Amino acid sequence: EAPKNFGLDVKITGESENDRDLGTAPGGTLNDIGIDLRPWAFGQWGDWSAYFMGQAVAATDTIETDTLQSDTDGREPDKSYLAAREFWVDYAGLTAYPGEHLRFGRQRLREDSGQWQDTNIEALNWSFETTLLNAHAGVAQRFSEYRTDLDELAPEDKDRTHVFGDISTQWAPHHRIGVRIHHADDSGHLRRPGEEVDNLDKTYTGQLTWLGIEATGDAYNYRSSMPLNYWASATWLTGDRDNLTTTTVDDRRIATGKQSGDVNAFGVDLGLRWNIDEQWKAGVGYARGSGGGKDGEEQFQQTGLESNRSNFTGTRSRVHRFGEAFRGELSNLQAATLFGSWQLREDYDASLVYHKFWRVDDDSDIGTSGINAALQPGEKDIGQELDLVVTKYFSALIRFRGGLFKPGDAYGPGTDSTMHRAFVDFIWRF
Ligand SMILES: CCCCCCC/C=C\CCCCCC(=O)OC[C@@H](O)CO
Ligand SMILES: CCCCCCC/C=C\CCCCCC(=O)OC[C@@H](O)CO
Ligand SMILES: CCCCCCC/C=C\CCCCCC(=O)OC[C@@H](O)CO
Ligand SMILES: CCCCCCC/C=C\CCCCCC(=O)OC[C@H](O)CO
Ligand SMILES: CCCCCCC/C=C\CCCCCC(=O)OC[C@H](O)CO
Ligand SMILES: CCCCCCC/C=C\CCCCCC(=O)OC[C@H](O)CO
Ligand SMILES: CCCCCCCCCCCC[N+](C)(C)[O-]
Ligand SMILES: CCCCCCCCCCCC[N+](C)(C)[O-]
Ligand SMILES: CCCCCCCCCCCC[N+](C)(C)[O-]
Ligand SMILES: CCCCCCCCCCCC[N+](C)(C)[O-]
Ligand SMILES: [Ca+2]
Ligand code: NA
Numbered sequence: 296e297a298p299k300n301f302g303l304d305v306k307i308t309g310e311s312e313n314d315r316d317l318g319t320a321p322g323g324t325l326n327d328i329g330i331d332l333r334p335w336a337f338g339q340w341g342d343w344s345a346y347f348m349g350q351a352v353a354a355t356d357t358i359e360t361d362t363l364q365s366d367t368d369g370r371e372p373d374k375s376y377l378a379a380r381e382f383w384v385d386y387a388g389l390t391a392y393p394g395e396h397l398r399f400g401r402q403r404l405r406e407d408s409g410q411w412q413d414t415n416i417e418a419l420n421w422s423f424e425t426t427l428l429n430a431h432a433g434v435a436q437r438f439s440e441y442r443t444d445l446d447e448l449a450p451e452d453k454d455r456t457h458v459f460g461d462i463s464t465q466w467a468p469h470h471r472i473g474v475r476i477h478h479a480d481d482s483g484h485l486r487r488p489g490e491e492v493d494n495l496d497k498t499y500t501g502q503l504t505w506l507g508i509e510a511t512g513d514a515y516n517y518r519s520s521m522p523l524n525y526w527a528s529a530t531w532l533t534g535d536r537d538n539l540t541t542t543t544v545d546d547r548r549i550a551t552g553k554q555s556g557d558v559n560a561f562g563v564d565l566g567l568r569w570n571i572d573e574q575w576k577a578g579v580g581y582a583r584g585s586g587g588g589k590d591g592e593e594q595f596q597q598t599g600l601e602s603n604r605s606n607f608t609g610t611r612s613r614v615h616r617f618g619e620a621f622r623g624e625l626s627n628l629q630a631a632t633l634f635g636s637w638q639l640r641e642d643y644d645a646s647l648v649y650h651k652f653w654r655v656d657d658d659s660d661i662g663t664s665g666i667n668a669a670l671q672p673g674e675k676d677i678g679q680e681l682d683l684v685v686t687k688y689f690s691a692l693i694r695f696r697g698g699l700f701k702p703g704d705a706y707g708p709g710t711d712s713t714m715h716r717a718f719v720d721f722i723w724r725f
């Protein structure tokens with residue numbers, strides 16, 4: 296029971312993916328296995344503490360062993376690599392509240408929805424968590440991937456600074472109301488007209504502010520004592536973007552200029568979960584990120600730090616809010632969701648999730664997704680998905696996570712009728 300100074304997490308993962316581009320491009324499917332080793336070190340001395348976690352990965356192909364991985368020349372991952380995941384120092388002595396502390400270094404930033412921040416990033420982050428009042432404030436920026444195989448940052452991350460904060464209160468037992476803010480500022484520059492544009496150039500620079508209000512009733516508490524749980528959130532995105540314009544000239548992309556415009560967009564996510572008994576749960580969700588509008592002003596996007604993974608099905612396992620296969624970003628996207636889940640004590644859980652997805656504006660792209668295929672102008676029907684997650688907890692666990700995506704009319708002729716992405720993870724902690 297003495298404070299544990301080190302450990303090692305060992306994960307074996309298999310991934311089957313077919314076909315991310317729906318058959319539109321060559322190869323690019325996965326059926327592969329890998330091991331991921333994460334040694335960690337922790338020290339604590341009165342109000343001070345410090346932590347390091349590293350990572351070594353070897354796999355048969357470039358599979359996803361980390362749900363929080365950076366998305367990917369200079370950005371080509373290798374089948375095997377080393378990385379530094381977290382390295383930070385923490386000071387808890389500003390106040391006597393044990394849930395209050397200040398953390399500096401590359402660290403896990405997470406809030407419960409996963410929709411604003413859920414990532415490892417260099418940050419200075421203040422947390423204040425007590426029974427009646429929670430608050431946080433921080434700043435973050437990526438300076439490197441800290442990986443042996445990736446030499447450059449993604450253009451969206453380069454020179455982008457994040458500032459954010461939140462504050463919330465438990466106004467009745469198990470019911471929380473709060474506000475949340477995030478601001479992203481780009482100090483980079485766009486290619487100038489006539490310059491060649493490649494995959495490591497920015498497509499835009501922005502100064503963007505998200506302002507959100509969030510109500511939850513054990514939304515993400517898998518151990519809730521209430522028969523009904525819920526989440527409701529509404530988020531306003533404002534600010535501006537300078538968008539790069541380009542043209543094609545001889546199989547090469549050339550910058551032609553740029554266009555600025557204000558953003559005035561809106562996102563909402565609602566959910567209701569029935570705690571039917573000690574084991575069974577089921578629920579419904581609706582979410583929408585606005586799209587299109589006059590000069591793209593209504594195109595909602597997320598912060599870029601989000602995972603969209605959360606305990607929304609009411610289990611210990613986190614699930615992708617917009618599908619393991621589709622992996623939607625809330626951006627010109629409407630989603631309806633139904634789920635059921637089962638758990639037995641701390642020993643097993645399982646969730647079955649259905650989604651239907653539509654575009655909001657049928658002449659605009661959606662944001663990120665786990666699908667790499669062009670949408671047909673004028674078609675709103677993105678598709679449907681069924682997901683299954685099943686876990687046995689032995690510390691250690693073994694989990695199946697799978698999604699089956701059925702493309703709708705927005706994907707069109709010559710695309711596959713079905714696509715899946717599935718994982719098995721076996722994890723042991725020493
Ligand atoms: C701004 C980034 C800060 C990065 C700090 C990285 C911290 C690295 C490793 C965490 C553990 C350091 C422990 C150092 C140490 O000698 O601890 C004494 C320990 O043996 C018993 O308490
Ligand atoms: C230990 C506690 C210290 C608190 C330090 C102060 C933290 C400051 C701000 C936290 C809230 C995030 C700020 C969001 C923001 O400033 O941008 C909005 C603005 O750009 C709209 O145009
Ligand atoms: C209770 C039913 C579970 C619902 C399905 C959730 C599991 C998701 C994926 C399982 C792997 C299926 C892989 C084969 C398949 O169905 O599609 C073939 C297609 O991907 C060819 O491109
Ligand atoms: C308390 C002192 C000990 C600190 C822990 C040392 C652990 C060993 C390595 C930490 C990770 C340093 C990696 C830095 C790095 O990868 O450089 C990134 C490049 O600049 C690429 O942009
Ligand atoms: C502009 C009108 C917006 C009205 C929104 C009202 C939302 C009402 C109910 C949604 C769920 C609220 C739960 C409140 C609740 O259960 O707490 C009451 C206390 O537990 C009393 O013991
Ligand atoms: C397919 C590869 C392995 C991935 C699967 C990991 C989870 C495996 C099995 C979980 C089984 C879920 C049902 C458990 C059940 O019905 O009751 C458990 C018993 O009551 C306790 O022994
Ligand atoms: C024990 C559970 C068995 C079901 C696991 C499903 C994993 C997906 C493998 C499907 C591969 C088929 N194909 C040809 C589409 O790649
Ligand atoms: C059931 C869903 C998880 C898929 C597991 C993926 C298969 C792992 C082992 C087969 C791949 C190894 N190999 C030989 C193709 O490199
Ligand atoms: C198992 C822990 C390993 C920790 C060290 C990993 C950091 C190495 C990063 C080197 C980056 C080299 N690069 C990308 C500039 O070519
Ligand atoms: C599609 C999922 C939507 C929510 C499911 C609703 C669950 C209602 C369960 C009623 C069962 C009443 N019972 C069995 C406890 O006496
Ligand atoms: Ca392909
Ligand atoms: Na403290």
Ligand code: NA
Binds near residue numbers: 516
């Ligand atoms: Na629950």
